[model samples]
Target chain A: PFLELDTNLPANRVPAGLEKRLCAAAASILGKPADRVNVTVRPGLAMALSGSTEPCAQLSISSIGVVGTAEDNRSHSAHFFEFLTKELALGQDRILIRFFPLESWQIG
Target chain B: PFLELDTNLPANRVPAGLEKRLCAAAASILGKPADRVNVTVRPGLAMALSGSTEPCAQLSISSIGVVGTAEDNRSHSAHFFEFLTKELALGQDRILIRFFPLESWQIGK
Candidate 1:
């Protein structure tokens, strides 16, 4: 039910209106309502990806009973990667994603 | 191996030395060396756990081939929870944890 985005890019580089766009994209991609999808963006994180630290990001998607097999995850990743590149101008190699299928989640 | 701790508590309230303690605990609990274990703490995050705005924390542990079965995860959880409660004074219910067993992870070149 939550998409957590952490980027090494400076906080100022995170484009405006990204939170709303991420929430909408996640909801649409996962077939969940916008209200049920939560997006958290944390820029200015200290991180490195693939031996480099230039404008990289790590995304974690956690949901209940929605994640599918590896193939399905790949499909989802494609959409997420595309959005990240288009919105933030991050290259495909700079972003990494992980999917978590939650068994116990409580949101109010 | 990495332990990422995020809390809704204010940054000032995060006790000093908590990061070192976390890395030590994670290394001990996961049977890894302190150098191999990375700990990241982000306080003052805008988060709500269990529908409340009060102090709450979420922990994610990611490692390669060390995370065990559900029962093993529970054991690790107990250790982590105890540490958090004692160090941060967060109630047991105020914290949540998840484990990720990674298949491929690259650290440095």
Candidate 2:
């Protein structure tokens, strides 16, 4: 299972300890081991929202058989949006989440 | 259709002409107009491949009703890998690609 966070904020603007928190959050949400959870934070993306260049972010969460349904996706989004807004001071409208309910994924 | 490239290479390491080429490649392969293709290149990723830190990259291509099947995906991969290797000088093993057949995606209200 992996959670990737992409944001338009500068790389240094990422809050300290956010990666650790994200791993924990993802593990709790996905019911996966903390060690098995991989998170990547990418900042300084050339992004726009509402046709504006204000700070915005997009998250991609993919796991095999973890994302069950649309309801499940909404629930996960709620938790993630809360955590991101609280940690990064990003407005709700500035964030987008995509869930990939992958039938197959590989890691080596 | 959208093609997003994430790489561990530094931002400055990205060549100037790669983005345009990617959009063109994607448009050509996906059978979509150039205007309908969206490509983003994100460099300076904290990434590891095969548990080692080296020059590696990942590309995620998602489109509606475009990625038809495994054969289609493999075909797309071949084109993408060729472009990436020639443009970035990355080994084939150092790059990974994921295809997402999205049912829905929204750009703006």
Best by lDDT: 1
Candidate No. with top DockQ? 2
Per candidate, the number of residue pairs that clash is 1, 0
What is the alpha-carbon lDDT for the whole of candidate 2?
0.76
| Per-candidate interface DockQ score | 0.12, 0.16
Model 2 segments more than 4 A misplaced: A6-39, A44-59, A64-99, A103-108, B105-109
- lDDT tens per residue, model 2, A1-94: 6678888998688886566678788778767777556566787778877798899989988865456588978988888888999888899999
Estimate every model's Cα lDDT from 0 to 1.
0.77, 0.76
lDDT of 2 by residue, B1-109 (tens): 8888888788788888788898988888877899889888878776544434568777877777645576776776887788888888888887777665678777775
Distance from true position, residue A50, model 2, in Å?
18
Task: Report the C-alpha lDDT of model 1 over A1-108, residue by residue, as the tens digit.
Answer: 777888877757887667677877887887777766655577777887878878888998886545678897899899998899998888899889998765433221
Compute the lDDT of residue B26 as modeled in candidate 2.
Answer: 83
CA shift at B17, candidate 2, in angstroms? 2.0
Give all TM-scores, in the order shown.
Answer: 0.61, 0.62
